[PDB]
């Protein structure tokens, strides 16, 4: 069975991690307890890439590239590979893990996206040449999850598109992640130690900011991340009466389109939270710690938030917006109690 996740690259990484005996969802994602509000807003002028005030959520914390690298003693390296080196790179990376290969959505027939390269590039995992000379590609996004065939010429055309709005040109993440025998024997020890460290990070509730050409980026970690997120999201309540109007200007239609997309993006982060929290509970169960947290279900609380988000971006109305805020406040409460109870046992 192909592994998958709410974010394509996480699904892809889970497949590569399994090749080298690592359970990414449980031992890497599930070992990294995190909760962060992120904002992009007006900072110091000029910021030419600041198109809008934007808010989202992340349960990814430091992220799987950082954790998978230090836990395996390997590397997760971004490169733009020249075309003359791409196939050799794909064969070479396979010995030690594998490769995430980027391509436009319109290069992937199963995405049914011939007419658009999409907002962001897609990614797949090359999984060898089949008997007939065609590449097997693993799709790690849950909706499309499975294995697909692509000819080698079509793969190289996909890696070097023209034009190239996303800059996919030979873009790979090389995962050279195969642990030593002594490290493989201790992965659950490392997962235990990462779990405690992320819990302490969460309770430390750090915040920061940075000025960029795309805006001031602000973040807030820990128990107040979701309360802060909900307070900020109340600012998009204008979308409800605006989305109900039927005669919208180009500019108002853009405001609604961007507002709906903010809640779509947020909903994918809530799906990821439910995925990650489920990983945490599988980790805690396998460590023998399920005792000290009782039956708290932060996975279920985030699943309910994700469903509220889907309902809201599908139908932008005040009832659906209020339900999302309630579900997020509940998830915040279950998270902080779960985190405190779990850290007590570590």
């Amino acid at each position: 069975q192909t592994l998958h996740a709410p974010h394509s690259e996480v699904g892809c990484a889970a497949n590569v991690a399994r090749r080298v005996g690592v359970d990414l969802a449980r031992q890497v994602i599930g070992a990294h307890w995190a909760s962060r509000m992120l904002v992009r807003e007006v900072g110091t002028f000029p910021q030419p890439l600041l198109d809008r005030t934007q808010v989202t959520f992340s349960a990814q914390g430091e992220g799987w590239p950082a954790l998978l690298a230090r836990m395996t003693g390997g590397e997760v390296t971004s490169r733009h590979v020249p075309r003359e080196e791409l196939l050799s790179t794909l064969h070479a990376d396979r010995a030690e893990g594998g490769t995430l290969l980027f391509m436009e959505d319109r290069a992937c027939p199963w995405l049914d996206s011939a007419h658009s390269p999409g907002m962001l590039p897609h990614v797949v995992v090359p999984d060898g040449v089949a008997p007939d000379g065609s590449w097997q590609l693993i799709e790690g996004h849950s909706w499309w999850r499975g294995r697909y065939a692509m000819s080698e010429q079509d793969l190289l055309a996909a890696s070097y598109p023209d034009p190239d709005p996303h800059h996919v040109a030979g873009r790979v993440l090389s995962l050279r992640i195969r642990p030593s025998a002594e490290r493989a024997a201790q992965l659950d020890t490392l997962a235990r130690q990462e779990l405690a460290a992320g819990l302490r990070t969460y309770l430390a509730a750090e915040c920061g900011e940075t000025e960029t050409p795309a805006g001031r980026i602000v973040w807030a970690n820990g128990p107040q991340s979701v309360p802060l997120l909900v307070e900020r999201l109340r600012g998009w309540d204008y979308l409800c009466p605006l989305a109900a109007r039927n005669d919208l200007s180009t500019e108002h239609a853009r405001d609604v389109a961007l507002g709906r997309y903010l809640f779509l993006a947020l909903t994918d982060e809530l799906a990821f939270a439910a995925y990650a929290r489920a990983g945490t509970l599988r980790l805690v169960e396998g460590l023998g710690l399920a005792g000290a947290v009782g039956g708290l279900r932060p996975d279920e609380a985030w699943r309910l938030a994700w469903r509220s988000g889907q309902k809201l971006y599908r139908r932008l109305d005040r009832q659906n917006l209020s339900a999302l805020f309630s579900a997020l406040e509940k998830a915040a409460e279950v998270d902080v109690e779960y985190a405190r109870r779990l850290l007590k046992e570590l």
Partner: protein, 77 residues
Amino acid sequence: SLLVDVLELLRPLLPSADTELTPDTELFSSQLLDSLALEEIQAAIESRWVPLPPEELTLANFNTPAAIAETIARTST
């Protein structure tokens, strides 16, 4: 049985009163249904059987009435 309940749930979502619906009819890869119909299916499952987490939301699980019925059966133990 579940397949009967799933076919009953889907008929009123289809493009036409005469849209052919069998257990193997392709629902999403065919653009017969869109994600507002998926929302109705998720919400029906949530209220009647066992609520589904994101890992169950796959085209393999949702693309046919037979696949949906199998999803509810598998997830309701």
